[PDB]
Design a protein around this motif. Structure first.
Motif, mmCIF file in Angstrom:
data_model
loop_
_atom_site.group_PDB
_atom_site.id
_atom_site.type_symbol
_atom_site.label_atom_id
_atom_site.label_comp_id
_atom_site.label_asym_id
_atom_site.label_seq_id
_atom_site.Cartn_x
_atom_site.Cartn_y
_atom_site.Cartn_z
ATOM 1 N N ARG C 162 0.717 -1.180 -0.007
ATOM 2 C CA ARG C 162 0.222 0.205 0.072
ATOM 3 C C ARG C 162 0.906 1.146 -0.086
ATOM 4 N N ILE C 163 0.296 2.423 -0.645
ATOM 5 C CA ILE C 163 0.969 3.596 -0.354
ATOM 6 C C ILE C 163 1.110 4.340 0.919
ATOM 7 N N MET C 164 2.327 4.884 1.376
ATOM 8 C CA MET C 164 2.652 5.266 2.439
ATOM 9 C C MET C 164 3.138 6.850 2.366
ATOM 10 N N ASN C 165 1.914 7.488 2.700
ATOM 11 C CA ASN C 165 2.167 9.248 2.426
ATOM 12 C C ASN C 165 2.183 9.835 3.981
ATOM 13 N N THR C 166 2.782 10.763 3.977
ATOM 14 C CA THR C 166 2.912 11.789 5.231
ATOM 15 C C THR C 166 3.014 13.214 4.940
ATOM 16 N N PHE C 167 2.421 13.980 5.708
ATOM 17 C CA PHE C 167 2.543 15.402 6.039
ATOM 18 C C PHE C 167 3.230 15.654 7.223
ATOM 19 N N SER C 168 4.661 15.943 7.059
ATOM 20 C CA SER C 168 5.488 16.045 8.273
ATOM 21 C C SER C 168 5.984 17.343 8.393
ATOM 22 N N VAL C 169 5.492 17.928 9.624
ATOM 23 C CA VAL C 169 5.856 19.066 9.725
ATOM 24 C C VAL C 169 7.455 19.287 10.662
ATOM 25 N N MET C 170 8.400 19.900 9.790
ATOM 26 C CA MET C 170 9.511 20.524 10.201
ATOM 27 C C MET C 170 9.922 21.327 11.403
ATOM 28 N N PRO C 171 10.818 20.998 12.486
ATOM 29 C CA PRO C 171 10.724 22.142 13.401
ATOM 30 C C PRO C 171 11.737 23.344 12.926
ATOM 31 N N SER C 172 11.546 24.205 13.633
ATOM 32 C CA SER C 172 12.239 25.530 13.274
ATOM 33 C C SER C 172 12.647 26.238 14.792
ATOM 34 N N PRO C 173 13.536 26.748 15.021
ATOM 35 C CA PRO C 173 13.904 27.659 16.162
ATOM 36 C C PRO C 173 13.199 28.857 16.701
ATOM 37 N N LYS C 174 12.468 29.335 15.180
ATOM 38 C CA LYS C 174 11.563 30.627 15.373
ATOM 39 C C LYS C 174 10.287 30.161 15.957
ATOM 40 N N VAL C 175 10.011 29.063 16.166
ATOM 41 C CA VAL C 175 8.692 28.438 16.724
ATOM 42 C C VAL C 175 8.883 27.098 17.296
ATOM 43 N N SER C 176 9.880 27.046 18.388
ATOM 44 C CA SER C 176 10.211 26.075 18.910
ATOM 45 C C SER C 176 9.732 25.742 20.330
ATOM 46 N N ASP C 177 9.275 24.548 20.823
ATOM 47 C CA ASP C 177 8.853 24.225 22.011
ATOM 48 C C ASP C 177 9.987 23.602 23.046
ATOM 49 N N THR C 178 11.020 22.875 22.108
ATOM 50 C CA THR C 178 12.124 22.221 22.872
ATOM 51 C C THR C 178 13.292 22.343 21.989
ATOM 52 N N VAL C 179 14.399 22.313 22.934
ATOM 53 C CA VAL C 179 15.895 22.371 22.496
ATOM 54 C C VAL C 179 16.345 21.249 21.600
ATOM 55 N N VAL C 180 15.804 20.036 21.959
ATOM 56 C CA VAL C 180 15.957 18.551 21.217
ATOM 57 C C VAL C 180 15.299 18.375 19.902
ATOM 58 N N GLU C 181 14.656 19.357 19.264
ATOM 59 C CA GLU C 181 13.945 19.115 17.987
ATOM 60 C C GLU C 181 14.850 18.758 17.181
ATOM 61 N N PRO C 182 16.116 19.401 16.841
ATOM 62 C CA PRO C 182 17.067 18.691 15.905
ATOM 63 C C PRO C 182 17.210 17.053 15.896
ATOM 64 N N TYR C 183 17.586 16.828 17.111
ATOM 65 C CA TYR C 183 17.576 15.310 17.378
ATOM 66 C C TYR C 183 16.098 14.349 16.867
ATOM 67 N N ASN C 184 15.338 14.836 17.336
ATOM 68 C CA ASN C 184 14.089 14.292 17.065
ATOM 69 C C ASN C 184 13.887 14.277 15.628
ATOM 70 N N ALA C 185 13.948 15.337 15.036
ATOM 71 C CA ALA C 185 13.623 15.411 13.390
ATOM 72 C C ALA C 185 14.647 14.587 12.756
ATOM 73 N N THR C 186 15.997 14.626 12.916
ATOM 74 C CA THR C 186 16.960 13.703 12.424
ATOM 75 C C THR C 186 16.724 12.262 12.545
#
Ligand SMILES: Nc1nc2c(ncn2[C@@H]2O[C@H](COP(=O)(O)OP(=O)(O)OP(=O)(O)O)[C@@H](O)[C@H]2O)c(=O)[nH]1
Ligand SMILES: Nc1nc2c(ncn2[C@@H]2O[C@H](COP(=O)(O)OP(=O)(O)O)[C@@H](O)[C@H]2O)c(=O)[nH]1
Ligand SMILES: [Mg+2]
Lengths: 48, 431, 432
Positions: C162-186
């Motif tokens: 089956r086809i796997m499709n996503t709408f993935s929202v990338m983090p930004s320091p401009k609208v960040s709720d956590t310092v660990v976002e680069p780790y979670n994103a990678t």
């Protein structure tokens, strides 16, 4: 002629999905492994 | 649901506990008998069959005097008798007596009471431990209890509110020894610790509240306001909150570097009436003034690794961002090279509540800044130097050795503190 | 190819997902009770792609709502269209992920995953012909990111075809709720490269910049950012939910958009840019709509399309307009901007026109580009990741959950390979 074209095809899609689950099952064997390790190190910590 | 157990150890811990629980009751509208005519307050207060609200707390002291005052006081009905635990003999300002000699007798009873409170929890988040560094109970009993809590509670969050000693209010010559011994032993057991320097509090009461000779009552009321600011996000559901885990995630980059600096504003005297109302910009500017700090140190000489701003009352996000932007134009606020996102902001709707007949004025808006700065190492250095002065001559060491402590424990504790000071130094170096 | 099974994971995933359902329900003339009250047969023609028909005149979203935290679910139920969702489809834990990918992927998430698969299996077995899955989530958090990618892997195991499709929202320091976002994103990007067929790279850096710079919103809220997300999600799904010739199903879209398996990260674009309140507006002609395809200002991923080359482009025009004018304008853009399209993929720009415009607009344009410029988004994440990882900052949050350093090194290396792969095709020539 067609038999040895569709059988040679059915073999080449079973392989392209064998190599899938086989190599995306060890992707659960490792997620079990570091996960066992997760509370194992936590336990041998209380051992001290 | 998401419960937090509060443990109050020794005179400092018990007396600060009295101030905290008095303030929580005023904030949630709970009467001194536990009656009340959100729903998040349930994280700190359990409810009985009679509709009474009981603090999820244990008060412990090795001497009965302090706790006897709670059980005779205004809030005697608030707490159930079993949660107010006292011994007979105090630790006599000796860490070895608190940890070993006297502590070992009451430890099992204290943990049985904590277990009974934990059994009433469906989603226990962890513990909040209040104690002094200087007293024998505050130092010795706390580290004993912290060790036992790690065993019984697995990987359960433990946060401290530690009373850093001050000579203006110091009761013992041996307070540097007790402070280093407790810090070494508790370091591997604590997740996050908020130090409160009694001199900083003494000076705020003198300067901002015009109290010539501040008493523990004056100091604790102010301390309670900072504790309430840190815990408001757990006891209330606002637009912007932070649970036990999010505090640690945002402020604690490395295991051992778990000591944030608290700065509170505004601190206004109950007289005047003209000295208000302060804007969001004014209270934010006050967080970067060393005079409003909870620990004496110089952040301008250190580097920031994390900054959390906890606003309370009539505060709008647009007001906050404007204030942070002007502060960013003041170049002087330096962060470590491995940290980009400096500001995590939280807004809790309820304005700060004050004790009736207290020294603090009622304000429309207040703010508590929790910052992890390398400048806090200055507080460890002061303590370590005082320890070294006495230890070089083995002055007073015999008191500890006599209780079954070994000299090696002193060397170990001091070497660990040297490593901690080295850690703060290593963290501030750029790659 | 008929049914799409929708999954919403984490705070961001549920917030964006709820907005998607209120936007598309309004377009298909479905009210918050599930009843069709529209006045166009086009609204119902392909209604079955996203909705199951329940007893009588009612339509129910084929949506599964997931979070490790209960609060977000309550907020969804309380919402405008909150009552439309299948009650049994809300799958929530009590112990959150605390913005930790490891908790979402290995610990807490693993404990809830089976309860989610049970609900996805129920929806999937009801299908006449399941196209596949559509997941909305953030990459900066713990649930959406860690559990979301865990779900992708578990679903892929049971539905590998089956086809796997996503709408993935990338983090930004401009609208960040956590310092660990680069780790979670990678850690999440590593999972998506291997497990999805198509990913819409929705960048908070770009959404914030559009709100602040273009919409002149001094302090953007998630509500402001989500208005741009929902406009984009409506645009990119137009072809799947209304009758059409081009990219009518998830597989045909993938076949036309994905030349190499790993290069399945799309840069979405939208014109005209509007703010929640802005129900003015009087503007936007066909040449105007077409010009914003190369406009970096209109991109939902913070990349300049003129910094790379388009491998493939899908462009969807909505509203009452000339198909002749659209074809002329689209050909003009490819001829004028020859240098920004790969020469070794002939006729790589496909256009579709839908008579139904989105709400509030009479005319709109949605762009889906597979551009080599998307490497700018991945480079940004890799540099933020390395700044932290070099010093092993916050690593205790992850190792404390049982994770090893190697996983971090591997995720980073895989993402850098992806960047290197985009660069390779950017530099490739039809010299033969
Ligand atoms: N802020 C504050 N500090 C206090 C209070 N009571 C004591 N301290 C400080 O704590 C230190 C003294 O330790 P105590 O807490 O009184 O002693 P203890 O824990 O009961 O231990 P023992 O009496 O030796 O068994 C000194 O630095 C005091 O200034 C209080 O109510 N508030
Ligand atoms: N666009 C958008 N981003 C959001 C929203 N909520 C959170 N985020 C982003 O998502 C990331 C945080 O993840 P979050 O979804 O809150 O955590 P989770 O609940 O563990 O999946 C960060 O990059 C936030 O900026 C939202 O409603 N809209
Ligand atoms: Mg005492």
């Amino acid at each position: 002629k067609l038999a040895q074209k569709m059988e040679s095809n059915k073999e080449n899609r079973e392989a392209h999905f064998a190599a899938m689950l086989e190599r995306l099952q060890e992707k659960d064997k490792h997620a079990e492994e570091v996960r066992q390790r997760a509370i194992e190190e936590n336990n041998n910590w209380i051992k001290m | 649901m998401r419960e937090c157990i509060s443990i109050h150890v020794g005179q400092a811990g018990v007396q600060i506990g009295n101030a905290c629980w008095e303030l929580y009751c005023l904030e949630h509208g709970i009467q001194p008998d536990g009656q009340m005519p959100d729903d998040s307050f349930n994280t700190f207060f359990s409810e009985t069959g009679a509709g009474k609200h009981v603090p999820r707390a244990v008060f412990v002291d090795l001497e009965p005097t302090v706790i006897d005052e709670v059980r005779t006081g205004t809030y005697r009905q608030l707490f159930h008798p079993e949660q107010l635990i006292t011994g007979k003999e105090d630790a006599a300002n000796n860490y070895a007596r608190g940890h070993y000699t006297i502590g070992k007798e009451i430890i099992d009873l204290v943990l049985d009471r904590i277990r009974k409170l934990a059994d009433q929890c469906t989603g226990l988040q962890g513990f909040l431990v209040f104690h002094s560094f200087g007293g024998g109970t505050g130092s010795g009993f706390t580290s004993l209890l912290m060790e036992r809590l790690s065993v019984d509670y697995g990987k359960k969050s433990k946060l401290e509110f530690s009373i850093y000693p001050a000579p203006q209010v110091s009761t013992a010559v041996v307070e540097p020894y007790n402070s280093i011994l407790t810090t070494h032993t508790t370091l591997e057991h604590s997740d996050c610790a908020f130090m409160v320097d009694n001199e900083a509090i003494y000076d705020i009461c003198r300067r901002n509240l015009d109290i010539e000779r501040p008493t523990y009552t004056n100091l604790n009321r102010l301390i309670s306001q900072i504790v309430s600011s840190i815990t408001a996000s757990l006891r209330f559901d606002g637009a912007l909150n932070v649970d036990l885990t999010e505090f640690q995630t945002n402020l604690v980059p490395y295991p051992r570097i778990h000591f944030p600096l608290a700065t509170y504003a505004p601190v206004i005297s109950a007289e005047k009436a003209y000295h208000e109302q302060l804007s969001v910009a004014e209270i934010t500017n006050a967080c970067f003034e060393p005079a409003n700090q909870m620990v004496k140190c110089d952040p301008r000489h250190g580097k920031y690794m994390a900054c959390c701003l906890l606003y309370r009352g009539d505060v709008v996000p647009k007001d906050v961002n404007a204030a942070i932007a002007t502060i960013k134009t003041k170049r002087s606020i330096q962060f470590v090279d491995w940290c980009p996102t400096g500001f995590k902001v939280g807004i809790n709707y309820q304005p700060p509540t004050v004790v009736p007949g207290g020294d603090l004025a009622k304000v429309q808006r207040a703010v508590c800044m929790l910052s992890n700065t390398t400048a806090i190492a200055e507080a460890w250095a002061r303590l370590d130097h005082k320890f070294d002065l006495m230890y070089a001559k083995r002055a007073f060491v015999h008191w500890y050795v006599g209780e079954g402590m070994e000299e090696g424990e002193f060397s170990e504790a001091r070497e660990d503190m040297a490593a901690l000071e080295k850690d703060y130094e290593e963290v501030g170096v750029d790659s | 190819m008929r049914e799409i099974v929708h999954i919403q994971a984490g705070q961001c995933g549920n917030q964006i997902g709820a907005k998607f359902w209120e936007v598309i329900s309004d377009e298909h003339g479905i009210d918050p009770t599930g009843s069709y009250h529209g006045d166009s047969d086009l609204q119902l023609e392909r209604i079955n792609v996203y909705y199951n028909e329940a007893t009588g005149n009612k339509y129910v979203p084929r949506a599964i709502l997931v979070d490790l935290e209960p609060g977000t679910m309550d907020s969804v139920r309380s919402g405008p269209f909150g009552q439309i969702f299948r009650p049994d489809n809300f799958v929530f834990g009590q112990s959150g992920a605390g913005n930790n990918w490891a908790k979402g992927h290995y610990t807490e998430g693993a404990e809830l995953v089976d309860s989610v698969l049970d609900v996805v299996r129920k929806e999937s077995e009801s299908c006449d012909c399941l196209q596949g899955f559509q997941l909305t989530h953030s990459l900066g958090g713990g649930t959406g990111s860690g559990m979301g990618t865990l779900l992708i892997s578990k679903i892929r195991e049971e539905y590998p075809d089956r086809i796997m499709n996503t709408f993935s929202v990338m983090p930004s320091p401009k609208v960040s709720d956590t310092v660990v976002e680069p780790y979670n994103a990678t850690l999440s990007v590593h999972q998506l490269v291997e497990n999805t067929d198509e990913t819409y790279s929705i960048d908070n850096e770009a959404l914030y910049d559009i709100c602040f710079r273009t919409l002149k919103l001094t302090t953007p809220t998630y509500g402001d950012l989500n208005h741009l997300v929902s406009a984009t999600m409506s645009g990119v799904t137009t072809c799947l939910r209304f009758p059409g010739q081009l990219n009518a199903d998830l597989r045909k879209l993938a076949v036309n958009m994905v030349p190499f398996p790993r290069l399945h990260f799309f840069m979405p674009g939208f014109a005209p840019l509007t703010s929640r309140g802005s129900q003015q507006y009087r503007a936007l002609t066909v040449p105007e709509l077409t010009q914003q395809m190369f406009d970096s200002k209109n991109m939902m991923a913070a990349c300049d399309p003129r910094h790379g080359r388009y491998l493939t482009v899908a462009a969807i025009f909505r509203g009452r307009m000339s198909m002749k004018e659209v074809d002329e304008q689209m050909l003009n853009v490819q001829n004028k901007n020859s240098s920004y399209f790969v020469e070794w993929i002939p006729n790589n720009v496909k256009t579709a026109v839908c008579d139904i415009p989105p709400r509030g607009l009479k005319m709109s344009a949605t762009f889906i580009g597979n551009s080599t410029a998307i490497q700018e988004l991945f480079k940004r994440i890799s540099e933020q990741f390395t700044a932290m990882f070099r010093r092993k900052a916050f690593l205790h949050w992850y190792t404390g959950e049982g994770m090893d350093e190697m996983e971090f090194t591997e995720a980073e290396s895989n993402m850098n390979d992806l960047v290197s792969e985009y660069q390779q095709y950017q530099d490739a020539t039809a010299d033969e």
